[PDB]
């Protein structure tokens, strides 16, 4: 049941979910098969719980696939994160991939940075320090 979502995620976003992930505040969350109207309102729904949010929405096999990097106001466990997302999106935890982001990957940092600059993502809050430091420029 995890492999199937990983496969769909790579087909949809163009990269392995494992390229981005390694209680805590920072979590990478992929929610599968979400209702379009619900997904469109995710930004507003999750805002009261975070300090930072990076959100993308793309269609997949099952419906809308939400990919978001979140920094919560309060530290949370994987289970607590899933419960909160399920309440907001009406999707069970079995249709989610939730794992802490990689914090020492220049590739992962670059991914969030670039997609963040792009209008394809909905970003709010203060950008995490690790993304800024690891992003290579020149």
**Residues of 64-96 as b/e, b for ≥16 C-beta within 10 angstroms?**
bbbbbbbbbeeebebeebbebbbebbebeeebb
Selection from 125, 132, 27, 6 nearest residue 82 by Cα: 27
Spatial distance between the Cα atoms of 112 and 69, rounded to a whole number of angstroms: 8
Distances, alpha carbon 30 to alpha carbons 87, 129, 135, 136, 138, in Å: 15, 22, 22, 25, 31
In three-state secondary structure terms, 1 is: coil
User: Angle at the Cα of 95 (from 127 to 124), degrees rounded to 5?
Assistant: 15
Length of the chain: 138
| The total number of structural domains that make up the chain | 1
Domain range spanning residue 70? Answer: 1-138
Q: How many other CB atoms sit within 10 Å of the CB of residue 6?
A: 14
Q: Report the C-alpha dihedral over residues 39, 7, 104, 106, rounded to 10 degrees.
A: -90
| Residue numbers after which the chain breaks, C to N beyond 2.5 angstroms | 22
Distances, alpha carbon 2 to alpha carbons 6, 17, 67, in Å: 6, 11, 15
Spatial distance between the Cα atoms of 28 and 13, rounded to a whole number of angstroms: 14
Give the count of alpha carbons within 13 A of 28, CB side only.
18
Selection from 67, 131, 93 nearest residue 2 by Cα: 93
Q: Name residues whose C-beta falls within 8 Å of residue 80's C-beta, 6 or more positions apart in sequence.
A: none
Selection from 88, 65, 51 nearest residue 12 by Cα: 65
CATH of the domain at 40: 3.40.1310.10
End-to-end CA distance of the chain: 41
Contact between residue 66 and residue 55 where contact means Cβ atoms under 8 Å apart: yes
* Ramachandran angles phi, psi of 57, nearest 5°: -140, 120
């Amino acid at each position: 049941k995890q492999g199937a979502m990983l496969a769909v995620f790579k087909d949809t976003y163009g990269l392995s979910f494992t390229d981005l992930v390694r209680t805590c505040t920072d979590w990478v969350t992929a929610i599968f098969g979400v209702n379009p109207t619900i997904a469109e309102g995710f930004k507003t729904l999750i805002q009261p719980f975070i300090l930072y949010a990076h959100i993308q929405c793309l269609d997949c096999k099952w419906g809308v696939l939400i990919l978001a990097l979140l920094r919560y106001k309060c530290g949370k466990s994987r289970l607590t994160v899933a419960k909160g997302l399920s309440t907001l999106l009406h999707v069970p935890e079995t249709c989610m991939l939730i794992q802490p982001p990689k914090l020492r990957s220049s590739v992962a940092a670059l991914y969030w940075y670039r997609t963040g600059i792009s209008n394809i993502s909905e970003v709010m809050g203060d950008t995490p320090e690790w993304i800024q430091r690891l992003t290579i420029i020149q």
